[PDB]
Each structure stands twice: as C-alpha cells, then as structure tokens.
Amino acid sequence: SALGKLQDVVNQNAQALNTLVKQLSSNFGAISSVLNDILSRLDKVEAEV
Amino acid sequence: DSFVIRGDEVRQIAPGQTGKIADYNYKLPDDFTGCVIAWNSNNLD
C-alpha cells in the first residue's frame, strides 16, 4: 500500500485499455457488435447503415 | 437506360440491391445519382 500512487497509475492504464477493448462488444443500436454478422445478415444498403 | 421487366422485379432497380435482375442484367452503383421511372405497359400485351 506504500506504492499506491504508482500502482494506481498502472491500474488506470489497464482499466482504460480494458474499457476500450470491452467497448468493441457493445451494439450502439446495431443488430450485432460482430462486424461479420452485419455483413452476412443484411443486404449492402442496410449493412452500411 | 431503358428496358421492360415484370412489375414485381421493379423493386430491384435501386442502388446496392440484390436479385436476378440486379445480379445478371442491370446493376446500379451504390452512389447512384439519378431517377428510376417505371409504369405498367400491360395494354401492349
């Protein structure tokens, strides 16, 4: 617990990168977050939206 | 560009479509700028 300042910096970098990767799984209103699903589920006009 | 199709096929005459006519006869590009004009000519038959 003495090194709390340095371990906090390492934790915040890991937390930020894990959050950035976890956000690839999110839909944002899209029919799937897996991009190859969208390109195989739909016709090109709907897929681009 | 002008031609005659069955009435059910007219839906395929739009940018980025798929189907027999859009695959094998007349394809519009995805960035098409233009108008598609169509009417029944059933009185000619």
How is this fold's topology laid out?
The structure is cut from a larger assembly and holds two copies of chain A.
Chain A: H1 4-22, H2 35-41, H3 44-48
Outline the structure in words.
The structure is cut from a larger assembly and holds two copies of chain A. Chain A is an all-alpha fold and 49 residues long. Chain A is built from three helices and no strands.
H-E string of chain A:
HHH
Instruction: Briefly note the structural class of the backbone of chain A.
Output: mainly alpha
Q: Major sheet of chain A: size, sense and barrel closure?
A: none
- The coarse silhouette of chain A is rod-shaped
Distance between the first and last residues' Cα of chain A = 50 Å
- Count of DSSP strands of chain A: 0
Report the β-strand fraction of chain A as a percent range. under 5%
Largest interface: A-B, 4 and 6 residues
Radius of gyration of chain A: 18 Å
Work out the helicity level of chain A. Answer: 55-70%
Quaternary structure state of the chains depicted: part of a larger assembly
Number of helices of chain A: 3
PDB class: viral protein
Keywords: SARS-CoV-2 Spike Protein Trimer, viral protein
Entry title: SARS-CoV-2 D614G 1-RBD-up Spike Protein Trimer without the P986-P987 stabilizing mutations (S-GSAS-D614G sub-classification)
Chains A, B: Spike glycoprotein
